Design brief:
Shape of chain C: globular
CATH architecture of chain C: Roll
Largest sheet of chain C: 3 strands, antiparallel
Number of strands of chain A: 0
Number of helices of chain A: 6
Strand content of chain A: under 5%
Number of strands of chain C: 5
Structural class of chain A: mainly alpha
Organism (chain A): Oryctolagus cuniculus
Shape of chain A: globular
Radius of gyration of chain A: 16 Å
Strand order of the largest sheet of chain C: 2-5-4
Protein name (chain A): Ryanodine receptor 1
Helix content of chain C: 10-25%
Largest interface: B-C, 18 and 14 residues
Radius of gyration of chain C: 14 Å
Order of helices and strands of chain A: HHHHHH
Helix content of chain A: 40-55%
Order of helices and strands of chain C: EEHEHEHE
Family (chain A): Belongs to the ryanodine receptor (TC 1.A.3.1) family. RYR1 subfamily.
Oligomer: part of a larger assembly
Main location (chain C): cytoplasm
CATH class of chain C: Alpha Beta
Strand content of chain C: 15-25%
Distance between the termini of chain A: 18 Å
Number of helices of chain C: 3
Structural class of chain C: alpha+beta
Largest sheet of chain A: none
Subcellular location (chain A): Sarcoplasmic reticulum membrane
Chain lengths: 111, 862, 107
């Protein structure tokens, strides 16, 4: 028999998903969720590029949640994850690509 | 009547590596002398004084536990009936201080020498002080087990445990014939001081969980001996071959034939030829050949005549001129190298060497007792003798195999699993959580999530409320046993995941998810929530584990799969306090019988106009569950009226239609004993607890058809084992009157003074037996003079209203061998930080620790 | 008929005079029961005078023949200590009282 589990690409994607945390901040996670729901709400890549800098208040304070301090601490104080100040051109396209690919995976999970 | 609380201090007990025990034969010398010396003492601090008693202990179920003890506070040495202690003023045997009249009634002053004399053969134990013999002797105490020099030092005291060594001298002269803990005591491990039954040993990373250690059990020091012209000729040839082999090796080493006996010249006179072989030499050679043949044929498989073709093959090796002796023999052995096989041959070699050493100890230790190093079989001596005997037997069996042959060889568990879980308030209903566990060795380990309502005395996996994953061979355990993945390695950590969104459990070992047979992320098939989830850890006997729940980033080690990569969070991210954990206690305590139990059923059956209502037992006739006997007693206690002519009352004398002689009286002053019910189930009747009496005394009645029962009071605390518990006493205290006459004796501290059940019957039990033990006789009113029942002196309100009433509070309680307990979150911060120096293993503690707890009036528990 | 078990360590050869004030550091202990009083728990020594009653007569006669720093087990008989009435709510009637008095006054 053949099914989704027989396909290799989905298994490889599921295996490589919990790898790219080095550039995945909780603010970046919120941006990814916003990009995913925008893609779901009838939008294309042009709208994502136009609205790539529209949102600015997503970078909330670290004291807003009882667990947000842990995420900020792990994202800041690690030798393998150093991100103090970076241009928006490289910290947005990757996030929106991750959001798009996870949205596609979720859509194809139950065809 | 009501519940009261008070502060108390924790008690600790250290234990050395010296093992002393008795058996049915050659076990030890039996005369050991030990001394303990105290440098610094601390006066009355906090609430009570510095509790410190010294004495011996036992390993037959004795296991002190900090925090929860017997009576008040922690279970110190001498509180129970399994250990003996002395604080220097009064003997402590059964949580009761025994007053003594000895010269020098003083406390443990600084710079004092304390010693005790222990006799293993003669049942007598006597203590000692700096300058006076301590009055008080023991008689007819427990012998089976292992004796340990235990101490009961509390928080804030320094003691030196000086037995022997570089600076281990005794200030006071030892009695003659007593071993001062020397002459090759445990020549396999270093002498170190360790706590008894450790379960929270510290580590460089975090606390380490330690399971029940496997000891040497008891009565195991004694050895275990065991019991054709062609065969005789083959044995003679093998004897000659091994003779010339050891002769040639001894000649090569530098030992030749001497005139008579040249010990200083390094000459061995036994190197003689077979032609001039001495008659005693031939005698013991044939004797050992016959013994070896008998041991070889003792197995169920004989040697067998397979081909017998290589017996006639003869070979020789190089014969240097220096190897020749004065006899003229030419010891040239044959060369063989095609006899290698499975190590079952090596196992047979080891077994034969063990049997030979056992029989040698049987025929050697039985006499002399002078210069034999005392002596133990091939389980505790040095490995040099074991290796020598092993090579001798392997070369012997090689010589036998080289001649064309083909030989091939044919109770209470106690140390059980220890379930570790958290409190029932830290439940999880929704959300992903991260769990870690570090392993040291590979054994009986089970790690995984489980239901909060975990049933005690239930194997992890053989239930619907456990989802742990067994650490032996890489198989899961949930309502059975199915293979899951790769087995563990030495060290590393163990990962355990959980998810509440879709109920999937993920197991990982080292940066990799454990693959299953199917080849996908195998889970436990969408576990329904029900109540919640809780991390449960297990530990087998002799295993060391490290439970890293995770309180900081440095605590986590691998965190490769999820944990932080996904929407997972560590279990203790923002818990400012260490997470409380509930371990599984091995102490057999009591609990009421649960209702609707499929095995046992107790119903309050009403009586008649002449018979008061009683309590019966209902059991299934079919043997659906037959594990062991039942341990039963009443609900409340029965105190003894102290003082008022007669200080002690309630003469103990059972009477079953006649006059018996129990001869078990004068148990003490108060003795809040219960009424035990010891029996089994044969005819679905067991026992019937009935109260029916109408005269000036009070007794209980039990009716049975065909079974065995024991109507003997179980005392305040009950700690039984198995095998029916027949004739298992603890001790008898012999008070000293400072003379050799004897004024009074102390025949008490009998937890279970039960005799045989066949005293009443002779051949069979055709009618019903009504045991009526009369133990209640306070007073009787002469106004009516009957013609007092029970539940009158036992309660606190119906004292002057004698009537056969059954209050709705007396319920039988079945003995749970396992009970749930919580260990404290803060242990001793020192715990012998020096770990024992060369000055005599000095141990000291500085930081005090206080703990306050309840005290149930009925059951002497904290 | 009162038994005293003096503990020899603790030195002291200054018997308490009549009319002066001395302190005690006792802890209460009921017979075949529990602890009801403890001066160590309050972290404050008890001050009382000798010869002006104001205490148990049995306790006074038990503590009379004692030296400085020498603790003992003063068992007070109930018929003269608290009588047949007793303290209403703390000490049960006709029960002996056991104390371990410790002396630390500097005089």
């Amino acid at each position: 028999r053949y099914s989704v589990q027989t396909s290799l690409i989905v298994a490889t994607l599921k295996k490589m998903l919990p790898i790219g945390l080095n550039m995945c901040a909780p603010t970046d996670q919120d941006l990814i969720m916003l990009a995913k729901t925008r893609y779901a709400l009838k939008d294309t890549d042009e709208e994502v590029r136009e609205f790539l800098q529209n949102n600015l208040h997503l970078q909330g304070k670290v004291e807003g949640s009882p667990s947000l301090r842990w995420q900020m601490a792990l994202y800041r104080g690690l030798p393998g994850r150093e991100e103090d100040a970076d241009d928006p051109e490289k910290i947005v396209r990757r996030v929106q690509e991750v959001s798009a690919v996870l949205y596609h995976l979720e859509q194809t999970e139950h065809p | 009547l009501l519940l009261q609380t008070n502060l108390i201090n924790y008690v600790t007990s250290i234990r050395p590596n010296i093992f002393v025990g008795r058996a049915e034969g050659s076990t030890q010398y039996g005369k050991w002398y030990f001394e303990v010396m105290v440098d610094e003492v601390v006066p009355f601090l906090t609430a009570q004084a510095t509790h410190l008693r010294v004495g011996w202990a036992l390993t037959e179920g004795y296991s002190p536990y900090p925090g929860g003890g017997e009576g008040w506070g922690g279970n110190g040495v001498g509180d129970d009936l399994y250990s003996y202690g002395f604080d220097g003023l009064h003997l402590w045997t059964g949580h009761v201080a025994r007053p003594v009249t000895s010269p020098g009634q003083h406390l443990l002053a600084p710079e004092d020498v304390v010693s005790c004399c222990l006799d293993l053969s003669v049942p007598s134990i006597s203590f000692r002080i700096n300058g006076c013999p301590v009055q008080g002797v023991f008689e007819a105490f427990n012998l089976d087990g292992l004796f340990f020099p235990v101490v009961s030092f509390s928080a804030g005291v320094k003691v030196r445990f000086l037995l022997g060594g570089r600076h281990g001298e005794f200030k006071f002269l030892p009695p003659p014939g007593y071993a001062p803990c020397h002459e090759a005591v445990l020549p396999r491990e270093r002498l170190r001081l360790e706590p008894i039954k450790e379960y929270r040993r510290e580590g460089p990373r975090g606390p380490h969980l330690v399971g029940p250690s496997r000891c040497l059990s008891h009565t195991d020091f004694v050895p275990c001996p065991v019991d054709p012209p062609h065969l005789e000729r083959i044995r003679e040839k093998l004897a000659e071959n091994i003779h010339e082999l050891w002769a040639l090796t001894r000649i090569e080493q530098g030992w030749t034939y001497g005139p008579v006996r040249d010990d200083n010249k390094r000459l061995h006179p036994c190197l003689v030829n077979f032609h001039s072989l001495p008659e005693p030499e031939r005698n013991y050679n044939l004797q050992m050949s016959g013994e070896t043949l008998k041991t070889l044929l003792a197995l169920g498989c004989h040697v067998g005549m397979a081909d017998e073709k290589a017996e006639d093959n003869l070979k020789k090796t190089k014969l240097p001129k220096t190897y020749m002796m004065s006899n003229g023999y030419k010891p040239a052995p044959l060369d063989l190298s095609h006899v290698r096989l499975t190590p079952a041959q090596t196992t047979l070699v080891d077994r034969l060497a063990e049997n030979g050493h056992n029989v040698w100890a049987r025929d050697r230790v039985a006499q002399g007792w002078s210069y034999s190093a005392r002596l133990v079989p091939y389980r505790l001596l040095d490995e040099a003798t074991k290796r020598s005997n092993r090579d001798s037997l392997c070369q012997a069996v090689r010589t036998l195999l080289g001649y064309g042959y083909n030989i091939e060889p044919p109770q209470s568990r106690w140390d059980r699993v220890r379930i570790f879980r958290a409190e029932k308030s830290y439940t999880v209903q929704s959300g992903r959580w991260y769990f870690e566990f570090e392993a040291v060795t590979t054994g009986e380990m089970r790690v995984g999530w489980a239901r909060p309502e975990l049933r005690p005395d239930v194997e992890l996996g053989a239930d619907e409320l456990a989802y742990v994953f067994n650490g032996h061979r890489g198989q899961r355990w949930h309502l059975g046993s199915e293979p899951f993945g790769r087995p563990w390695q030495s060290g590393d950590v163990v990962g355990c995941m959980i998810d509440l969104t879709e109920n999937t459990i993920i197991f990982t070992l080292n940066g990799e998810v454990l693959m299953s047979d199917s080849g996908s992320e195998t889970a436990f098939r969408e576990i329904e929530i029900g109540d919640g989830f809780l991390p449960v850890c297990s530990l087998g006997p002799g295993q060391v584990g490290h439970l890293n729940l995770g309180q900081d980033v440095s605590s986590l080690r691998f965190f490769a799969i999820c944990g932080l990569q996904e929407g997972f969070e560590p279990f203790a991210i923002n818990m400012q306090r260490p997470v409380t954990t509930w371990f599984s206690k091995s102490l057999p305590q009591f609990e009421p019988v649960p209702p609707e139990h499929p095995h046992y059923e107790v119903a309050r059956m009403d009586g008649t106009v002449d018979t008061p209502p009683c309590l019966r037992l209902a059991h299934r006739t079919w043997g659906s569950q037959n594990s062991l006997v039942e341990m039963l007693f009443l609900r409340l206690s029965l105190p003894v009226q102290f003082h008022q002519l007669n200080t002690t009352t309630y003469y103990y004398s059972v009477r079953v239609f006649a006059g018996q002689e129990p001869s078990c009286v004068w148990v003490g002053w108060v003795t809040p004993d219960y009424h035990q019910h010891d029996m089994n189930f044969d005819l679905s009747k067991v026992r019937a607890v009935t109260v029916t009496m109408g005269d000036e005394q009070g007794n209980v009645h039990s009716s049975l058809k065909c079974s065995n029962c024991y109507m003997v009071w179980g005392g305040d605390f009950v700690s039984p084992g198995q095998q029916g518990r027949i004739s298992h006493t603890d001790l008898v205290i012999g008070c000293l009157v400072d003379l050799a006459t004897g004024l009074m004796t102390f025949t008490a501290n009998g937890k279970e003074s039960n005799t045989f059940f066949q005293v009443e019957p002779n051949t069979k039990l055709f009618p019903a037996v009504f045991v009526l033990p009369t133990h209640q006789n306070v007073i009787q009113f002469e106004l009516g003079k009957q013609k007092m029942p029970l539940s009158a002196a036992m309660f606190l309100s119906e004292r002057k209203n004698p009537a056969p009433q059954c209050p709705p509070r007396l319920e039988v309680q079945m003995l749970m061998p396992v009970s749930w307990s919580r260990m404290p979150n803060h242990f001793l911060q020192v715990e012998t930080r020096r770990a024992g120096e060369r000055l005599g293993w000095a141990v000291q503690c500085q930081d005090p620790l206080t703990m306050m707890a309840l005290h149930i009036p009925e059951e002497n528990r904290c | 008929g009162v038994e005293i078990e003096t503990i020899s360590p603790g030195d002291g050869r200054t018997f308490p005079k009549k009319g002066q004030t001395c302190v005690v550091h006792y802890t209460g202990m009921l017979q075949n029961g529990k602890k009801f009083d403890s001066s160590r728990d309050r972290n404050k020594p008890f001050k009382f005078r000798i010869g002006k009653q104001e205490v148990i007569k049995g306790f006074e006669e038990g503590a009379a023949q004692m030296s400085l720093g020498q603790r003992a087990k003063l068992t007070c008989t109930p018929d003269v200590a608290y009588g047949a009435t007793g303290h209403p709510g703390v000490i049960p009637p006709n029960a002996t009282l056991i104390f371990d008095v410790e002396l630390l006054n500097l005089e």
